[PDB]
Design a protein around this nucleic acid. Structure first.
Ligand SMILES: [Zn+2]
Ligand SMILES: [Zn+2]
Ligand SMILES: [Zn+2]
Ligand SMILES: [Zn+2]
Lengths: 114, 48, 96, 67, 1134
RNA sequence: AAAGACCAGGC
DNA sequence: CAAGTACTTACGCCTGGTCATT
């Protein structure tokens, strides 16, 4: 799915077929490095981009004064009542109005959507 | 000419008395605005 | 009414004094119109070219004289010309 | 600039009531009481003394053209 | 220990402290003072030394010395130059600049001689009035009045050739920042641009673009959603793929390039987005070949590889991104910043970042007089050095010697600054067309509010002809920085803006202490950090350059705020922003940022305790000022882009306190929300009740109001000086008016305004003015007009002289009366000069004489006030004559309320004709009741109510916008307590018949202001007057006795009427009529000697077949102009 | 004094 | 025969002041 780099020149590895062995080999083009591959997926085109936004959110946004906070929804991990909530703030928001919560108190950083 | 010279007798004005309503209508207007705000809060919550 | 050979400027029509006024400066001087100045430049370059053709010139000084004269004729006719320097007065101001 | 004699709306002389107004305000009184003590019952007259700006004091600070 | 329910006095105490210390024209003065003390020295020293060659010469300029202004007369004796002398004598208030020069000459004899040319004069910098270098600095009011300067005069204007010039702040996009935009239909989808300047030390700006090449592919490489990042470098004709640029900096491996671009490889989406850009540059794989690829695409490809490589390296280091660095080894820093731009671009492409708002005001910097005069001074000093180097080089081929004093042309600096400030075209004289115009306007002195609005004005440089609405709209970010209301109507709406009351423009601070503190207080520089550690750390930007990364950002922001509050390492004008969601921290010390002072909120309570207000109430004999308040950590300057990370409480008493909670994390609080409004919009009483366009109309109208514009108008001989007779300070005032000095210099008067429809002469927008009031001095004004004449010696025997022309000594004469002139050719004051009468007798000796005396304007009928003689700069005799005309308000004049209610005086009824109350209060002005309801101006009504209540009570009412303790019902009850109707109505009696008017009229004292627009300055009549020299049509204008224009729309209207004859009369007979003779054989006009009757057409030898054609002279000129373009417009009549 | 540019403004 | 480029046009009228060049 991502990019796998060569071990010698660190330039990009392009996919290739090992004709004699019939196996997917990531072959280098700056050099002759060839590596056995395990993903068996050259390319992925997620056009629907059903991406969960929780991975992007950073817990430091919990200490933003401008964001709103509710005591009604407690954190699932630490049970802390206060939670800072905000919308997507990114792409695909023109058809999405779901709220995302990040728990407060230092060192928790939990994030979830309801 | 004739209507202006009658308006000399009758007269016309504008002032604060024409921009103030009875306390009942102020109450009704405030209640309608608050009901609309509560409706829009409900719609925001429903969309969230 | 219009032959193609007439379109190449072989005689340049100097407009009369009315089109290019000469405003009297307090009865002491006479400030000239923009067309008058451009015509002065055209006359200078044309006289220089005629003199050089009479002398013999150097076939590249003739080239620069012809280029300058053609530029002056065109910029009297049209100064908005793209890709060419805009004519300026004695100071920095485009000609009308 | 200087105190307008002859209040515009009605016509009462408010041109001699400025120095008395200043003295009265400086001494004890509120502005309304000073205006009453000068006999300016009508509010148009009160708008003259009350809202005046005595710029002639600022003007007089400058040296004259000739001495 | 807090301020509840006493807050209204506390906020205004602190606001008054602000305006007592800072003032209204502080941005101009501070910008200029920084320019003189720092920018001039820095520019001169940073200029490269002059190196000449054979012996070698070195010239170095060490330190500057700007003296106080002085005037060098014909004899050359220095003398102090008071500003009023500059105004009167048409002088320039400028101060000389001296610079110490060291000249080291090396003669190859192993001994180089150093000669010091000390205090070398090189020019005269104009000095802003009331700057730290003006002779008016630090002087008390008594001293200024001894100098005939008005103590209320703000300062902040230069004096150039006698005129007063105000430098308007010019907007520009904030340099040293990365902005990711999206063009509508370009070949680029997303474009990140960075405008880079090396701490404003050199060059205007050398921007860099990094675009993404849309969606359409290049045939066989792009087969995805849109990729192939490309880079548009400066001085490169076409685009360069970004990976090639990265490799040109020595980062060959694609892992290193990605590490600079992508900060965490665990995010496959960004890798998928950047992979095709790598595929484009797969071919180029070495540093030298990449540099060649860049170089061969430059302005002119080099013949050899070495030249191309050298040019490419020079472009990469010097011009491409100079703010990050220009000293050799800076390639790693440039790589990191270029990767940051590509990373912003990829964030926008994936959609994780909002595209930067166009008109966001954090993206704008204002160039006040400081940066602008610096921009001109850098150019002029470059020119002075260029000329001195040219002089030295042409003098060193001989090899004799060289003199700096002769070589330095002081005219360069002096005249360049003078011209740029005077004409307004910012730049060199030779490049006027390419130069910015509209900067350095003339300070309009009609009203004090106009002077203040002009000294505090911002000008968006975008062309006024743009049809796009977005750059003109009021952005949300203007809150508290720019007046939401004040903007000129017309095609310059939204592009000429005015500052809010509290706005302060940062003057500049060198960011050395902030960098030192960051380096000492943790922080890891970009050189000594592994690229894999940059994903989880914040990025600290100082003045836009990426100074490094930090691991514990919250502690850094807390510590930096503490420092700024206590003002030790960080000055108060430095902004610090923590973009939490994007793990960035930006610190700005750049000059031009717009900030406002906001109270600090800690926990849920103000740091502004009762002690601070207690010490400020005792401001005198306690030495507690605004600066003590700021240095105590109570108030803080917040600029526009730190206002994003600040949650603001509008008022304390309502938001800090616990309730149904809305926000429990307030970080700052506003002193009073009435400081969003600017200088001219703060005079509006109850502006929150009006419709906003009416507030804009008032903002425009207040500058045109009439009053005492400056208390020393007696000494200043200025053109178009209106001075009102009896100004009155408003009875419905706003507290802000105390700081604009509007009470001290009022422009207007309180009129008993009746909102009634009396006799129909107030319909539409007109007003009915009481003739008796205007009779007793209402709204009466004086119109001082100054005439300036200058004796001169132009020719050898051509001499101008002030002397009274006799009947027969001057060939040129006019039908005016010359009897009013004295022996000197000047009328003594007191002489009642009517129109066309001679003011300043003057004649020129022709090579017997030709009169050139100055007449008056038509139909003035004034009386001379003051006639002044002096010597101008050149030493000739110079005269200035002021004529005053008492302009009694007539029924063409214009009058405006403080709420956009404007109108001409329809008719002037007498007092008996005016309606009267049972008491005898006849309205001074009757306005139409129809004006109000549609435009919904309600500040007018409430202001009448408050004026009635205030005039009755005896205080001056408060009309502060957002007061929440002055309601309509409260004012109504207070009015009912005085024996009047609670709504302000009064039973009115018709003055004609005596009857009561069946409808009760709303009467109240409203502040009405007279405007400069008077009908006697607008009425023109034309009947066969002068004609232009060229068109032979009536001149343009009222002063030239010209005629009204019959434009194209008028002729279209007449054609619609089917009116051929009137159209012909207007476009033929009324204007230029003419007769020409046209040959019949050829339509070319024929020679026509009418007296000899010999009509001959050269070109066909025709002398008989000629016809007379009556055509407009304009058409004759059109035909002749065509003939000079070889076109033959033949006029055939057969 | 003249037309050229600019600026501000009025509807 | 498409893809590229350049050119021309963008309300009406009116008021004043300022300046450089003649
Ligand atoms: Zn490899
Ligand atoms: Zn938690
Ligand atoms: Zn009165
Ligand atoms: Zn003929």
């Amino acid at each position: 799915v991502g990019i796998r780099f060569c071990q010698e020149c660190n330039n990009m590895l392009y996919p290739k077929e090992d004709k004699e062995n019939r196996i997917l080999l990531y072959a280098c083009r700056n050099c002759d490095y060839q590596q056995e591959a395990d993903n068996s997926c050259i390319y992925v085109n997620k056009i629907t981009h059903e991406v969960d936004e929780l991975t992007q959110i950073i817990a430091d946004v919990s200490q933003d004064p401008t964001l709103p906070r509710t005591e009604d929804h407690p954190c699932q991990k630490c049970g802390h009542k206060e939670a800072v909530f905000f919308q997507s703030h990114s792409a695909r928001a023109e058809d999405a109005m779901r709220l995302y919560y990040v728990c407060t108190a230092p060192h928790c950083g939990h994030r979830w959507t309801e | 000419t004739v209507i202006n010279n009658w308006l000399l007798i009758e007269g016309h004005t504008i002032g604060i008395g024409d921009s103030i309503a009875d306390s009942k209508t102020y109450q009704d207007i405030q209640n309608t605005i608050k009901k609309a705000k509560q409706d829009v809060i409900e719609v925001i919550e429903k969309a969230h | 009414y219009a032959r193609p050979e007439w379109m190449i400027v072989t005689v340049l029509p100097v407009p009369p004094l009315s089109v290019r006024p000469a405003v009297v400066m307090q009865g002491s001087a006479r400030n000239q119109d923009d067309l008058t100045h451009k015509l002065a430049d055209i006359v200078k370059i044309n006289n220089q070219l005629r003199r050089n053709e009479q002398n013999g010139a150097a076939a590249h000084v003739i080239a620069e004289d012809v280029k300058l004269l053609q530029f002056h004729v065109a910029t009297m006719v049209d100064n908005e010309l793209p890709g060419l320097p805009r004519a300026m007065q004695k100071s920095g101001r485009p000609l009308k | 600039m200087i105190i307008p004699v002859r209040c515009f709306t009605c016509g009462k002389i408010v041109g001699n009531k400025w120095e008395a107004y200043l003295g009265l305000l400086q001494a004890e009184y509120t502005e309304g009481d000073a205006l009453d003590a000068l006999g300016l019952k009508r509010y148009c007259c009160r708008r003259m003394l009350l809202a005046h700006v005595d710029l002639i004091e600022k003007l007089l600070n400058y040296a004259p053209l000739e001495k | 220990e807090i301020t509840p329910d006493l807050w209204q006095e506390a906020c205004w105490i602190v606001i008054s402290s602000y305006f007592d210390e800072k003032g209204l024209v502080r941005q101009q003065l501070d910008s200029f003072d920084e320019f003189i003390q720092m920018s001039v020295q820095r520019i001169v020293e940073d200029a490269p030394p002059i190196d000449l060659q054979p012996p070698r010469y070195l010239l170095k300029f060490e330190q500057i010395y700007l003296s106080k202004p002085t005037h060098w007369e014909r004899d050359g004796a220095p003398s102090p130059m008071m500003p009023n002398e500059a105004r009167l004598r048409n002088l320039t208030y400028s101060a000389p600049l001296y610079v110490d020069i060291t000249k080291t000459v090396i003669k190859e004899g192993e001994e180089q001689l150093q000669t010091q040319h000390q205090k070398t004069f090189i020019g005269k910098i104009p000095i802003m009035l009331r700057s730290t270098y003006c002779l008016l600095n630090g002087l008390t009011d008594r001293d200024l009045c001894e100098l005939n300067e008005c103590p209320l005069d703000p300062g902040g204007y230069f004096i150039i050739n006698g005129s007063e010039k105000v430098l308007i702040a010019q907007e520009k996009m904030a340099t040293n920042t990365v902005y990711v935009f999206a063009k509508k239909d370009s070949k680029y989808a997303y474009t990140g641009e960075c405008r880079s300047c090396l701490e404003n030390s050199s060059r205007p700006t050398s921007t860099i673009w990094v675009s993404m090449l849309a969606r359409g592919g290049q045939g066989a490489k792009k087969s995805a959603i849109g990729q192939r990042i490309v880079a548009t470098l400066p001085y490169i004709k076409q685009e360069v793929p970004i990976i090639i640029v990265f490799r040109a900096l020595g980062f060959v491996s694609d892992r290193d390039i990605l590490e600079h671009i992508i900060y965490d490889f665990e995010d496959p989406e960004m890798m998928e987005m950047v992979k095709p850009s790598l595929d484009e540059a797969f071919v180029i794989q070495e540093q030298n070949v990449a540099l060649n690829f860049i170089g061969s695409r430059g302005a002119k490809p080099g013949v050899t590889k070495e030249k191309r490589i050298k040019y490419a390296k020079e472009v990469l280091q010097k011009e491409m991104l100079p703010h990050v660095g220009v000293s050799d080894f800076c390639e790693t820093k440039k790589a990191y910043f270029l990767g940051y731009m590509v990373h912003r671009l990829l964030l926008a492409a994936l959609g994780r970042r909002e595209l930067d708002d166009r008109d966001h005001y954090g993206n704008k910097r204002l160039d006040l007089a400081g940066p602008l005069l610096a921009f001109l001074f850098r150019g002029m000093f470059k020119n002075l050095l260029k000329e001195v180097r040219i002089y030295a080089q042409k003098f060193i081929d001989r090899g004799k010697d060289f003199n700096l004093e002769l070589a330095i042309k002081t005219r360069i600096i002096s005249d360049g600054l003078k011209y740029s400030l005077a004409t307004g075209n910012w730049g060199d004289q030779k490049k006027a067309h390419q130069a910015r115009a509209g900067v350095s306007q003339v300070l309009n002195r009609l009203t004090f509010a106009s002077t203040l609005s002009h000294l505090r004005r911002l000008n968006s440089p975008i062309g006024r002809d743009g049809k796009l609405a977005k750059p003109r709209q009021l952005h949300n970010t203007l809150w508290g920085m720019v007046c939401p209301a004040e903007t000129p109507e017309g095609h310059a709406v939204g592009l000429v803006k005015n500052l809010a009351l509290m706005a302060y423009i940062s003057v500049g601070s060198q960011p050395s202490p902030i960098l030192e503190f960051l380096e000492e207080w943790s922080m890891e520089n970009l050189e000594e950090i592994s690229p894999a550690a940059i994903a989880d750390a914040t990025k600290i930007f100082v003045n836009g350059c990426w100074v490094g990364i930090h691991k514990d950002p919250e502690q850094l922001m807390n510590t930096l705020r503490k420092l700024r509050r206590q003002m030790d390492i960080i000055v108060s004008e430095v902004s610090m922003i923590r973009d939490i969601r994007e793990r960035e921290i930006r610190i700005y010390t750049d000059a031009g940022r717009i900030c406002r002072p906001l109270l600090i909120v800690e926990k849920q309570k103000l740091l502004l305790k009762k002690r601070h207000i207690d010490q400020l109430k005792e401001r005198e004999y306690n030495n507690y000022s605004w600066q003590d308040l700021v240095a105590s950590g109570v108030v803080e300057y917040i600029d526009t882009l730190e206002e994003e990370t600040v949650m603001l409480a509008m008022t304390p008493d309502d938001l800090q306190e616990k309730e149904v909670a809305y926000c429990s994390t307030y970080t700052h609080c506003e002193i009073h929300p009435s400081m969003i409004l600017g200088v001219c919009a703060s005079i509006i009483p109850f502006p929150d009740h009006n419709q906003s366009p009416r507030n804009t109309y008032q903002s425009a109208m207040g500058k045109q109001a009439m009053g005492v514009y400056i208390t020393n108008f007696h000494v200043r001989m200025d053109t178009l000086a209106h001075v009102l007779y009896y100004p009155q300070k408003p009875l419905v005032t706003t507290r802000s008016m105390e700081y604009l000095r509007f009470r001290e210099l009022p422009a207007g008067i309180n009129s008993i305004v009746a909102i009634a429809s009396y006799t129909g002469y107030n319909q539409e927008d007109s007003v009915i003015m009481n003739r008796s009031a205007v009779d007793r001095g209402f709204f009466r004004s004086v119109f001082y007009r100054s005439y300036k004449e200058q004796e001169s010696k132009k020719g050898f025997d051509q001499e101008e002289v002030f002397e009274k022309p006799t009947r027969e000594t001057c060939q040129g004469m006019r039908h005016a009366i010359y009897d009013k002139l004295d022996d000197d050719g000047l009328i003594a004051p007191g002489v009642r000069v009517s129109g066309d009468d001679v003011i300043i007798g003057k004649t020129v000796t022709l090579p017997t004489k030709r009169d050139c005396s100055t007449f008056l304007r038509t139909s003035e009928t004034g009386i001379v006030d003051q006639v002044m003689v002096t010597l101008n700069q050149e030493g000739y005799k110079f005269c200035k004559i002021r004529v005053r005309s008492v302009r009694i308000p007539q029924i063409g004049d214009k009058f405006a309320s403080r709420h956009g209610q404007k109108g001409t005086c329809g008719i002037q009824y007498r007092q008996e004709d005016m309606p009267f109350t049972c008491e005898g209060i006849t309205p001074d002005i009757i306005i139409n009741p129809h004006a109000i309801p549609s435009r919904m101006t309600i500040g007018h009504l409430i202001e009448c109510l408050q004026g009635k209540v205030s005039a009755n009570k005896g205080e001056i009412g408060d009309a502060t916008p957002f007061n929440d303790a002055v309601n309509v019902q409260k004012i109504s009850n207070l009015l009912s307590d005085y024996g009047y109707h609670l709504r302000g109505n009064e039973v009115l009696y018709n003055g004609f018949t005596g009857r009561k008017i069946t409808s009760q009229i709303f009467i109240g004292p409203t502040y009405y202001q007279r405007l400069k627009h008077m009908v006697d300055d607008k009425i023109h009549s034309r009947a066969r007057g002068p004609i232009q020299i060229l068109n032979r049509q009536p001149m343009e204008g009222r002063s030239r006795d010209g005629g009204l224009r019959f434009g194209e729309m008028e002729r279209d209207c007449q054609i619609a009427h089917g009116a051929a004859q009137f159209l012909r009369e207007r476009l033929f007979e009324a204007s230029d009529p003419y007769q020409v003779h046209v040959c019949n054989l050829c339509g070319i006009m024929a020679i026509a000697n009418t007296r000899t009757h010999t009509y001959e057409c050269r070109g066909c030898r025709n002398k008989t077949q000629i016809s007379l054609v009556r055509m407009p002279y304009a058409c004759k000129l059109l035909f002749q102009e065509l003939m000079s373009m070889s076109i033959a417009p033949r006029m055939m009549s057969v």
